[PDB]
Amino acid sequence: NIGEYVKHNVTPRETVLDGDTAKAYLRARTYAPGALTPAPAYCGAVDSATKMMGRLADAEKLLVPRGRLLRLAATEQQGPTPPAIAALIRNAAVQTPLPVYRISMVPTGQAFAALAWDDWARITRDARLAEAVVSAEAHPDHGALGRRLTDRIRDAGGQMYVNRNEIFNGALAITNIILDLDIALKEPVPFRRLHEALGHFRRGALAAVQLLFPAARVDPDAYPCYFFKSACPVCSCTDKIGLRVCMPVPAPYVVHGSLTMRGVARVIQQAVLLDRDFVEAIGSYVKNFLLIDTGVYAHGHSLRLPYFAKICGRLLPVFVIPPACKDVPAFVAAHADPRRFHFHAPPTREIRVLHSLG
Amino acid sequence: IVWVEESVSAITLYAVWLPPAREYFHALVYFVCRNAAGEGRARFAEVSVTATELRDFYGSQAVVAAARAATTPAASPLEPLENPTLWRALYACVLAALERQTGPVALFAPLRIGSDPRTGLVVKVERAWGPPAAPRAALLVAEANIDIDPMALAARVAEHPDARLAWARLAAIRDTPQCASAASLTVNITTGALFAREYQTLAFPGAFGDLVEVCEVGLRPRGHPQRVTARVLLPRDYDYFVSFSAPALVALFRQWHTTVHAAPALAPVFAFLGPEFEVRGGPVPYFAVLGFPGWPTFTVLVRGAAAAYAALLGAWPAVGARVVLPPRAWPGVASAAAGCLLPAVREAVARWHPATKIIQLLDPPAAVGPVWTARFCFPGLRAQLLAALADLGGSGLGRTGLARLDALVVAAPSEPWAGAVLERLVPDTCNACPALRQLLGGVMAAVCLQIEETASSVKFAVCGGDGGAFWGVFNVDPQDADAASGVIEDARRAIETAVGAVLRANAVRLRHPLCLALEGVYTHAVAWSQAGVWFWNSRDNTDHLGGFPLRGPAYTTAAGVVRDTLRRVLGLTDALTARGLMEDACDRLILDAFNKRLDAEYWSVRVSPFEASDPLPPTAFRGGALLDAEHYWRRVVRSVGVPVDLYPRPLVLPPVDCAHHLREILREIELVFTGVLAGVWGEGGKFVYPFDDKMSFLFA
């Protein structure tokens, strides 16, 4: 079973913070409450590798009272004055912690972008379904509605807008369970089969999520799991089929650690491989079975974000609508809020911090 | 030989020369004398000092090396840094020659002043009668921007790895005097008139005539074959300054000197001393004027510094332990006092070694249950004993320094400035002579063996201490009732009278009769180290904790937590429930420390110049005029160390290493808690707090 695996092979450590220390922890170790709320234009620090090393060397010359992907990821604080990043970003109304991104550039080379806010509509308007189009799509069965909605859909400071990888910052907490599926497959796969296989991914993974987070009312019907499939509704995708599954951390919990989230991912992996439905629905297509790169949660490592290509599969949503969902317009709309697909986002009394699994 | 009834305000060294001779030198001293009305006048005295007296106040150097400190009369402005004890020596020896040749001399006190009109020099001084002139005070605020190159200020610490940076700052200002020439300076001397002064560069452009009076007096010193004229600055309507940039004052007074002493006449000394003038600093602040200006600068209440000035003739703390008696005349008094003691006490004085078990005490770790604990003390017994024994050995060496000591002893119980001076002088004279270490050890041993012997008979049982401070359990009281004040009173009287009787029986005579303080009545106590003891009163929830380090604000919050935790823990009258209370206290402490995870000044510890510490960032070497406030303590956070005071405010820091600091604090709290658990409940289990396992993540 899975109870057995999370009875022997995982050792939870949680620390119930409480009262004001809870708010302090949330504000301190997650992105600021406006880092991921949309904005008319970006205030950030975007340049190539070399120009970023220079601009760091120039912000060091104004940060003399103490002390490139560790250092950008390091530059966080606030105090009651502007934060220390403001020497690099060059505004005074920046707020921290704030995202740091790795940007592949044509033809080669890497750029980084620490930004206090961005225009998330410019990124996700050519993927957003109008509230009316949803509300008129009229299609009762949730496999049916999810599949039809999926059918509908449609310079460094410019290259950030087609390739953008998010850098894990182990200083920060984790409020979302960002899984990185890399299903390799021998014969191609239709899309209704994949969509139902994902309906069976969510159910097993939510059972695993509920075992790992015991004091959480994670109803395996309405709990949101957000799926993004890389474009390659015909699948047309041979060799490899890249998914991305993002789940909110359940209510009172937050996760701390690279090893803690490596453990969470591996438990979800074994739980979905222990669901007999999933490996029927998806087997005989799938060569290997390692569906989850649990080593992507290491500090300094990057995951391509939804709505970004590769240097070109835009990770675009596959609405695996919850069984017994409640407000379908809102579930569709959340595939666009950046808070639902960054590691260290603000959570949406006490909290418990799962800082170890073993 | 005219006598004027007056009141000397300051005594300061003007010149130091050697006559057509080889083995002695003279000095010329400057007197700031004031009439009954306050009307200032300026007199002088001449003194001679031999080679031997100099070596005595130095503790062997040579008088040609204390007359080539007549290079201080130029613009080479920080000559004491070259050899500080030489100046402490020269000034103490002049103040001894002056009382030994001119007679008793007392700042601010009514006096009788002679002269010699053929020469104008004061020849004799005596006491007198009259309601003297109140010392008026002048306020001083001064700031300066010396441009020291912060790569030269790092070479010094390259040579002297523990060097306080006020010293490196002064040493640079010594290696390039011109840094004080081109230096902004602002001064605002309020005198009840007003003296502000812009100085964009201090070598370029209220009245300096309503603040000082420039006086020229003609003198015929025996040391000179010529009449020589002394030019001075006589303060008007003020007698001292109250204020700290030591280089600011140095460069200000150096400008005043270069200006006043421009034309042909005689040039004063210009020497200053302070803790900034030693490489390793010195705990207490002071700015000793012993030269040009002519009057002090109390770098702070202020009645304290004023009275200390007046009592010790102004040489304290400038000269050090030389106030009381020369360094190399302490072995004689040590031996002589040793001889006068009763031979049992003398065998004690001769086999004292610092780590000895004289009284049987509660062996740590151990606790005392519901009893009637009392904690006593003899206020300042080491100072009283040093004074008394110096008297009793007096015939081994004059006694004017010992009279200063005796004034400080009779004044300590009622004035705290005297207590401060004693607490700083008794250690430092023992440091100047170890046979004093041993004499004090022996007499304190005798004073402990009594107290033990008397406690045998007064229903008291000494449980710990040293003999000037001790505590114990009245193991006869009924653990209850109002017949406990009576027994503690009887015990305090018995021990006071017995210790007094013992000290007499050895011919040690105390300035003022011993008082045995009762510093608290308690009902529980736990002891976990030699110095670590916590006390608690169950009747009224009052306590005392001693032995915990207080190295910063984090440690005072921690000590409060340890005290509240021990109150609950001893309110349980098993061990496991105690451990629950202890880990609950540590949990709540780490969380509330998280709320202050940004407050750098809170996590900063103070590190002495002796305890090896974090190295300096080169970025701290250009903290400008804040390095000049670093004379003793360095306040450091941490992983890389930050001297939080060598940087302007507010700081801009990576996260403070709260795990490192909480680890330190938890180690000390764990000493306390292991002590209490072992002592009260007999657990062999060292208390340990899981930090790396729970609560480490909060600071990762």
UniProtKB/Swiss-Prot annotation, chain A:
Documented effect of changing residue 80 to T: In strain: Nonneuroinvasive mutant HF10
Protein's cellular compartments: Host nucleus
Origin: domain of life: Viruses
Keyword Zinc recorded: yes
Keywords: DNA replication, Host nucleus, Metal-binding, Transferase, Zinc, Zinc-finger
Coiled coil regions in record: none
Annotated site residues (Essential for primase activity) in this chain: 180, 182
Keyword Cell division: no
GO molecular function: DNA-directed RNA polymerase activity; zinc ion binding
Biological processes, Gene Ontology terms: bidirectional double-stranded viral DNA replication; DNA replication
GO cellular component labels: host cell nucleus
Family indicated by similarity: Belongs to the herpesviridae DNA primase family.
Protein purpose: Essential component of the helicase/primase complex. Unwinds the DNA at the replication forks and generates single-stranded DNA for both leading and lagging strand synthesis. The primase initiates primer synthesis and thereby produces large amount of short RNA primers on the lagging strand that the polymerase elongates using dNTPs.
Subunit structure: Associates with the helicase and the primase-associated factor to form the helicase-primase factor.
Designated name of the protein: DNA primase
Species assigned in the record: Human herpesvirus 1 (strain 17)
Swiss-Prot record, chain B:
Similarity comment text for this entry: Belongs to the herpesviridae HEPA family.
Function: Component of the helicase/primase complex. Unwinds the DNA at the replication forks and generates single-stranded DNA for both leading and lagging strand synthesis. The primase synthesizes short RNA primers on the lagging strand that the polymerase presumably elongates using dNTPs. The primase-associated factor has no known catalytic activity in the complex and may serve to facilitate the formation of the replisome by directly interacting with the origin-binding protein and the polymerase.
Subcellular location: Host nucleus
Effect of residue 321 to V: In strain: Nonneuroinvasive mutant HF10
One protein family per Pfam: Herpes_HEPA
GO cellular component, one term: host cell nucleus
Coiled-coil region(s): none
Reported effect, residue 431 to D: In strain: Nonneuroinvasive mutant HF10
InterPro entries to which the protein is assigned, alphabetical: HSV_HEPA
Entry's transmembrane regions: none
Effect in UniProt of substituting residue 229 to M: In strain: Nonneuroinvasive mutant HF10
GO biological process, any: bidirectional double-stranded viral DNA replication
Subunit comment: Associates with the primase and the helicase to form the helicase-primase complex. Interacts with the origin-binding protein. Interacts with the polymerase catalytic subunit.
Organism name: Human herpesvirus 1 (strain 17)
This protein's UniProt keywords: DNA replication, Host nucleus
The protein's name: DNA helicase/primase complex-associated protein
